[PDB]
Amino acid sequence: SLEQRTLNPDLFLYKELVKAHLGERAASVIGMLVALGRLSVRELVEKIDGMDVDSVKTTLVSLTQLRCVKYLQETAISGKKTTYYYYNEEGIHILLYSGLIIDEIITQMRVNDEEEHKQLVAEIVQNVISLGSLTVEDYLSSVTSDSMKYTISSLFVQLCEMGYLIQISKLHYTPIEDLWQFLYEKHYKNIPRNSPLSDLKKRSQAKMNAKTDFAKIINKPNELSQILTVDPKTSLRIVKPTVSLTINLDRFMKGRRSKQLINLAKTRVGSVTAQVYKIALRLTEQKSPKIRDPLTQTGLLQDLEEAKSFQDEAELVEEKTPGLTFNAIDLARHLPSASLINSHLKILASSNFPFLNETKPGVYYVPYSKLMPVLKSSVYEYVIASTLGPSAMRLSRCIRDNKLVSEKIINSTALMKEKDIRSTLASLIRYNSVEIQEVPRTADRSASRAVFLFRCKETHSYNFMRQNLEWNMANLLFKKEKLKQENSTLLKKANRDDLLPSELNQLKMVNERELNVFARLSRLLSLWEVFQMA
Template identity: 25%
Template sequence: MANDRYLIPVLPEHSRSVVDRLLEAEERETEKYTITTAKELLAIKQAAIASVEAELNVDEMVGMKRKAADPLNAQTKKFAMDGSRKQELKEVDEHVFFVVNYEKYNMIFRNELVVDFATDRINRTAGQVVKAFFEHGKNSMKALHEDDTPSATPLHIANLLPADLVERGDIVLQHDSMNQHHKPGMQDIVRGYITLLQTDTAGFVKTKDGAGANQYTINLGKLRKTMKRRVLESLLSERLGVATCRIARILMEKGKLDENQVQKLAMLPPKDTREKLAQLTLHGFVDIQEVPKSADRAPGRSFHLWYVHQEKCYKELLTDVYRTITNLQQRKKHELSLRRALLEKLEREDVKANMDLLNDHDKANLEYMNKLLERLETSKSRLDLMLLILRDF
């Protein structure tokens, strides 16, 4: 687990933040110059970032030691493939303390959310293609907030997919009239799905020109915004209705608009448009910017533009999610306190051995309690997924 970064070592210097390390590295680089121009300041900052990244990479392997070669034991030396590179597995140093690397697990949960999103939006095979991109670059992805995954070619992705994908026929490819009877291969299907994922408005895949020809990557930077907006729109639909959500979506896509423009684009009567804008403003999803026509800033001679501040909305949603989780925890604690006598009875050894000792009222109460606790835990798990998208993605 330590070699795969599920566990990370704990050292005294880890108490210093990355910002402090960066500032110290910039001071060391600045001492090398007597007069600093704008170009040299940029070079100092880039050198400091490279120095901090090198220090962090060195810290990653602290707590690991190379395995001793033993020709009699073939298991003493194993290799893990990472593209064309090989990484030798190392033993854990027993004198170093380790902690759980939560960022690694959040990356796994994030990847599963993206795969499920691609499956719901396109189909199951598209989700497998996206999953193959994550599988290809899992050993190279170190940070949760990276903007894209390591690049891969259609051949790399085709080698990671099951062979029965060719027989599914869930995508129709265009062929020349001379090759109508040509059966598409695995690479043809992968290229078709990559094109489909690339042209989708969610922004699953993009080309990575700097890595060479036919290099593609998962566009995590755009998916981060798309999935946050998806959560916001779903909550708006549940709370305020579909028409109100449509107005908010128009404002997010078009930017700042006045009331007449919103009315025309939303195709709603003036009264309904005004009421729904007031609801959005009351709940904090929409703000108003005043644009005066004259220097006296009279309200009657000013434009009022409506707009959605998305980052502010995400922070408000995050606060609401925390509040809801707290309420669920308090509700669970309250329900358990009401059934303290039943819980004490369930802890008895004779009842554990034979549940028939409970009377009908206790059995009905136990069944109701289990259903209620299951609903509360299900709601908490859904809120945890929202937290992952809004906070950690």
């Protein structure tokens, strides 16, 4: 498969994933958008070949409903209005992560056991996002007139008011950079002429007012006081029925992040403390620091006096937030003993992995701004220890604490035989985990009169393998639909009955092999998703 392994970035993932379960006419249009960036429909037509002008709009409105792109409008002063179209980074993640949304709902919601909506609450998650956008009136108008609809309608306020089912709007549906644009000149035109002094300080007036509003505008969907209707008749608490809503991945990604940390807990402590650490984290999953950090996504990230201010206040948010700082007296009742919950939590402060590290005496809280880089430094190293020899794990850690090491001191710090490390180190040059620093003894970079120094270079060393997995996420599901191209004469027959004896076997051998794919797709999905904590 050399045709694909060479000239394909992440676009090879995005093109085929909408080609997996959606029409083929829309796989080529967003392949044009991701390749060329941003463009209008009027000149979209000649970039592709074979789709008519109205036939784009039918195809684009087909792709609009699942929230997979984001449009943005600007007009010309002498001209009419024009509408650009971008690509949405996280909306296409939803049908990527679509299998794992189902298994988390059951695992987060353990208050019910053998309920009659085990089939239905897993269907509801498949009924809220498969058609796209969704409102309250659209599922009560089903075949079920009542069938205890008042239970099922009031089931959702338990399921929505914990989060991640926020009302949809234009705010998260328009891009963030262009959202940051048209609010910047508005506050810049709130200050007119005749405020003359410090013109290079007058740009901060709109800039400080932007940050106060930009947190408030993203809090408008997080504002949960406008999605309630306290009904004085026949009810006690219900959402507003005229509200269009879909999934919100923000809690899901934080919930997946808490799913990752407990695995690191079970490695560095035994079985008793791992059960302790999982319970306290579930209480604070619904409100946590943001994983995507939209404020650090775009803005004035250039200058260090502000680039340091994107984590000075963001750290100060984390410890000074009232909604997570637990007092270690609440935790004893939630487990299915004030001395033991001190004792099992005492060793979380002792370990050099900074989770439950720093606190005020009596209260406890886990940090994230100084933790997940140790998580990024954890999952990176052992994968190298798996894909080649554990000697390569030894050389990687020797360059960690000792920076810019030469070839004499590696035999002084570590100790293996001299001929075997070069047959291991050069494997790590090829994958861009170690680098080369050159020092010239003579003029004009003469290669013989030189020695060669190393480095870790902590930023390039992750960005290589993140695309080495994004392509590996993209490679194996090409063999999914290609496997469906052959043996296609009987899956059409197996979609027609709702029975030849010898043909039934070759429907099973194409069944357990694709059953291996989704398991092999899930395992490396967790090894990839840790590299999104930027």
